[PDB]
């Protein structure tokens, strides 16, 4: 593996000698839990919604309120 043999443009990875092309099912299988993997996406989703309430309220009232629970008069 010297990064010179490309399968396609911008795709030049090759496994190292003695290493598999796919690690799934192998000894190096990360065995990642999908519930863990999806946590980040959920967070961003929640922050974006919390910010939307903040910005819309700000636009309407002219006074910024960071505490979402204190929003809606």
């Amino acid at each position: 593996y010297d990064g010179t043999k490309c399968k396609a443009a911008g795709n030049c990875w090759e496994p190292k000698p003695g290493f598999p092309e796919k690690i799934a099912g192998s000894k190096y299988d990360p065995k990642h839990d999908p519930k863990e993997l999806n946590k980040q996406a959920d967070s961003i989703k929640q922050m974006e919604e919390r910010n939307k309430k903040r910005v819309e309220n700000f636009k309407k009232t002219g006074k910024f309120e960071y505490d979402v629970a204190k929003i809606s008069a």
Binding site: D2, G3, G10, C12, E21, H32, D33, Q40, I44, N51
Partner: protein
Amino acid sequence: NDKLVELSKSDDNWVMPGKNYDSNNFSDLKQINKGNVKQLRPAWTFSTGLLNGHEGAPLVVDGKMYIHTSFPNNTFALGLDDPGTILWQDKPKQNPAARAVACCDLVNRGLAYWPGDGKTPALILKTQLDGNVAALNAETGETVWKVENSDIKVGSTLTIAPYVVKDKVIIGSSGAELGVRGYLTAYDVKTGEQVWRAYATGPDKDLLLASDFNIKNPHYGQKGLGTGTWEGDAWKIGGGTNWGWYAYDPGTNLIYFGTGNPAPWNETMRPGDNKWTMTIFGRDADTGEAKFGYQKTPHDEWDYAGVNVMMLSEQKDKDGKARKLLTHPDRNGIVYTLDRTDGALVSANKLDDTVNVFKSVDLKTGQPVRDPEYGTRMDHLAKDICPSAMGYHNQGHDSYDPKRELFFMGINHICMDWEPFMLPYRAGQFFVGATLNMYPGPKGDRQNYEGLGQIKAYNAITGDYKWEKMERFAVWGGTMATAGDLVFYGTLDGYLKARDSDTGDLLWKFKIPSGAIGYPMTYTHKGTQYVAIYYGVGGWPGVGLVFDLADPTAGLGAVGAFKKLANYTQMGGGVVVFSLDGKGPYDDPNVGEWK
């Protein structure tokens, strides 16, 4: 922002990180020049009241200096005519848990400024370690808006300085060591409204690619690579956070910056080029669409987080064509110069002849030629790999002299041993998977553990180094150049030094309180030129001293490499301002006195 562009042409201001949109860190002021630097002395000082690393540099706008600190990220505004009086201070209440998810120190790179329009006042924009972004009225310090950008519960924090372009604030991200998938966001500077958000890995929709992405260099790769160069969903915790610096060309409307390293550090756990991590992007300021993306380090095996400084210039290439360029010294040991209009590779030279991880970078394929002997892999202890994970260049913001066409770069001379290990991913927990040992490179003293840095003058077209000089420690922090034929920089052992731009000769130095990990800045106030710099050692190199760690392996391998730092400096935090003969606001001692 046009107002910012105009403001940036006044020597009385320093309005944004990097000085100007070119990110020059170059001043035309020559009051302080090589013939009189020896007369440079402190004019006044200010303690921030916090310890830990003090990165970045202060802003000076409208006769006021704005200062930022390490966590909890306080902000102070001082009037230049009577610095003794703190105009206003903002002291954020943040969750202490934020501290536990910072890989490195509780550092912050800086503030940004928006000039204001008619209804909205000028604003100071700041990031907080806890992931919030805030805009403060520049004259009163009151909070105008505050929104959440990152979530510490998942290991996502903010250390990056905001960047203001037109009426938008661009915010990066931090957390690749905790497997956070990178993303940058643009918010409307007046309301905090999210305008656009682009990711570093995953589906093209998430990547926010322009229809003509990589049109001129299709061999860099185009569509489907954010998932295609990964096995399964591994890209979901793929890293690629951007916590470095930006540059902007109003002419192309593109913001230039690099994305960080892929997660985990254990390369065997993520087969594939791991695309869009480690890449130089050119994204539209208004829509965030990527016009070009060049991956510097496919399938990272050394934590060469590709987030370094972007410095723009216009020089004639080897064929005599005048090009609009970007120069970028990366962690991997290579300085890249690309055409900033299309991303075409112009030059990719080694920062030091001792590199070894790559034999070279093929300019036609754009692929770096790896030396298999210095790669990392499971069940194998790699040794003598140069550069180390700290890179031959890190977070430091360098400078460029337009008249001389020379880049003055703060370099690191550190190599390493590396062995990875398997580990699970748990949101909020570290996800590194490598044990390192770092030490001075071949040109330093590996027995006494000194000679960890270098400072060099470089020409991007010829690839020639006008001068190179060794330094006791890594030149973290960056550089600043002046039309007075001086190159200024702070050192980890506690000095602000000035070197001759043409020869590199040390002309002057001053023993500041603690080591510097930020860059020098300059401005004029009432006819007098001042050079200011933060003191307060920390960041990655000072993690051993900062957290009183002893195991050479602790602090991600930095503890052993910097074992000698403590014999030359202790923590600190503040600003020292210099001027010829130390002339300043209190030359009339009655100024500032109670009456």
